[PDB]
C-alpha cells in the first residue's frame, strides 16, 4: 500500500478513496476493508457495465481492493440534474446498460444485494457501471431494499437486484425517491401504501414469511399513472413487472432487455460537470 497515495475521500464494508499509483501514475479507486477466495473470484468477473477489479492486496491482516476509476456517481448526477431532470433517452440508455450488467452477473450466479445511486458510476462517454458487486456476500439506506428481504426471507434470489433497479428507474424519472423509508417497518409500510398490502392472491406464501404479521394494515393499490406520471405506457408496464411482489413473478434482467420499451434505445452523452 505504500505504492498508493490517497488523493481524496470518495465515500464510506469499508472506506473508498481516490488514489494514485506512484508506480505508474495511474488514478484508481481504493477500498479499505473464505473471504480471500470469494474476492479473488470477482476479479475474473469482467463486463463493460461492471467496474473492473484490478487487484486485491492482503497485508497486515488488512484487505485492500483496487478498482478502475470512473468520473462521477449517479447520486451526484441526479442532484445536479434536479432542475430540469435527466433526459428520457439518457435514462433509457442507463437502464438498458445496467440490465445488461445484471444479466451477466446473474448468469454467473452472482448477486449485488445493495444497489443504490451511490454505487452506480458514469463516465463522459455515456457508459454506466455497477460497483461493489459480490462484495455484499463476502446510516445505511433502506430505500431500495426488496420486500422479501424486509419480510425475513433467508435465501433470496437475483430478483432483489431487479427490485432495487426498478426503484432507481422511478427516481430518475420523477426526481423523487419512490420509497423513502427511515426504518424497516416504515420502509415496508411505504411499499404497502403504494403497491397494496400483499396477500396470498398476489404473493403465494407471503403470510408464512418469518416477519409477516396478520396484524399488518390492509392498504389498496394505486395506479402507476399517479406513481410515475412522466413515464410513457411502455415504461410503466416494464416498471410494474420489475416491482412485482412475488420474486418468482418479477421479471428477469434477460427478459427485461427484450421489452418494447427498449426498441428505440440509443446511447446519448451526458453533460457532466467535473
Ligand atoms: C458525498 N459527496 C461529498 C460526494 C462524494 C463523491 N461522489 S462523486 O460523484 O464526486 C464520485 C464518486 C465516485 C467516483 N469514482 C469511482 N470510480 C470507481 C469506483 C468508485 C466506487 C465508489 N464506491 C465504490 C464501492 C466499491 C467499489 N468501487 N467504488 N468510484 C468519482 C466521483
Curated annotation (Swiss-Prot):
The protein's required cofactors: Mg(2+)
EC top class named in words: transferase
Reactions accelerated catalytically: L-seryl-[protein] + ATP = O-phospho-L-seryl-[protein] + ADP + H(+); L-threonyl-[protein] + ATP = O-phospho-L-threonyl-[protein] + ADP + H(+)
Residues at the site labelled CDK7 binding: 9, 75-76, 142
Comment on bound cofactor: Binds 2 Mg(2+) ions.
Principal location class: cytoplasm
Keyword check for Protein biosynthesis: no
InterPro entries: CDK (IPR050108), Kinase-like_dom_sf (IPR011009), Prot_kinase_dom (IPR000719), Protein_kinase_ATP_BS (IPR017441), Ser/Thr_kinase_AS (IPR008271)
Protein kinase domain: residues covered: 4-262
Keyword Cytoplasm applies: yes
Record-listed Phosphotyrosine modification sites: 13, 17
Pfam families assigned to the protein according to its UniProt record, in alphabetical order: Pkinase
Keyword terms of this UniProt record: Acetylation, ATP-binding, Cell cycle, Cell division, Cytoplasm, Cytoskeleton, DNA damage, DNA repair, Endosome, Kinase, Magnesium, Meiosis, Metal-binding, Mitosis, Nucleotide-binding, Nucleus, Phosphoprotein, S-nitrosylation, Serine/threonine-protein kinase, Transferase
Example GO biological process: regulation of G2/M transition of mitotic cell cycle
Processing and modification events after translation: Nitrosylated after treatment with nitric oxide (DETA-NO).
Family: Belongs to the protein kinase superfamily. CMGC Ser/Thr protein kinase family. CDC2/CDKX subfamily.
Subunit structure: Found in a complex with CABLES1, CCNA1 and CCNE1. Interacts with CABLES1. Interacts with UHRF2. Part of a complex consisting of UHRF2, CDK2 and CCNE1. Interacts with the Speedy/Ringo proteins SPDYA and SPDYC. Interaction with SPDYA promotes kinase activation via a conformation change that alleviates obstruction of the substrate-binding cleft by the T-loop. Found in a complex with both SPDYA and CDKN1B/KIP1. Binds to RB1 and CDK7.
Protein name as annotated: Cyclin-dependent kinase 2
Gene: CDK2
Amino acid at each position: 500500500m505504500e505504492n498508493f497515495q490517497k488523493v481524496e475521500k470518495i465515500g464510506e464494508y469499508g472506506v473508498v478513496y481516490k488514489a494514485r499509483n506512484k508506480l505508474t501514475g495511474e488514478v484508481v479507486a481504493l477500498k479499505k476493508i473464505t473471504a480471500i477466495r470469494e474476492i479473488s473470484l470477482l476479479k475474473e468477473l469482467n463486463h463493460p457495465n461492471i467496474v473492473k477489479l484490478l487487484d486485491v492486496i492482503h497485508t497486515e491482516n488488512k484487505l485492500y481492493l483496487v478498482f478502475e476509476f470512473l468520473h462521477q456517481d449517479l447520486k451526484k448526477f441526479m442532484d445536479a440534474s434536479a432542475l430540469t431532470g435527466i433526459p428520457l433517452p439518457l435514462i433509457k440508455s442507463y437502464l438498458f446498460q445496467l440490465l445488461q450488467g445484471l444479466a451477466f452477473c446473474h448468469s454467473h450466479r452472482v448477486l449485488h444485494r445493495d444497489l443504490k445511486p451511490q454505487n452506480l458510476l458514469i463516465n463522459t462517454e455515456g457508459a454506466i457501471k455497477l460497483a461493489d458487486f459480490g462484495l455484499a456476500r463476502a446510516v445505511v439506506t433502506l430505500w431500495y431494499r426488496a420486500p422479501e428481504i424486509l419480510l425475513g426471507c433467508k435465501y433470496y434470489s437475483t430478483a432483489v437486484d431487479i427490485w432495487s433497479l426498478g426503484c432507481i428507474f422511478a427516481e430518475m424519472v420523477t426526481r423523487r425517491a419512490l420509497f423513502p423509508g427511515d426504518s424497516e417497518i416504515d420502509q415496508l409500510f411505504r411499499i404497502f401504501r403504494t403497491l397494496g398490502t400483499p396477500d396470498e392472491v398476489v404473493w403465494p406464501g407471503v403470510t408464512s414469511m418469518p416477519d409477516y404479521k396478520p396484524s399488518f394494515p390492509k392498504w389498496a393499490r394505486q395506479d402507476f399513472s399517479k406513481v410515475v406520471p412522466p413515464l410513457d405506457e411502455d415504461g410503466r408496464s416494464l416498471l410494474s413487472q420489475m416491482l412485482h411482489y412475488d420474486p418468482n413473478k418479477r421479471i428477469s434482467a434477460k427478459a427485461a432487455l427484450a421489452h418494447p420499451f427498449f426498441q428505440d434505445v440509443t446511447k446519448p452523452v451526458p453533460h457532466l460537470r467535473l
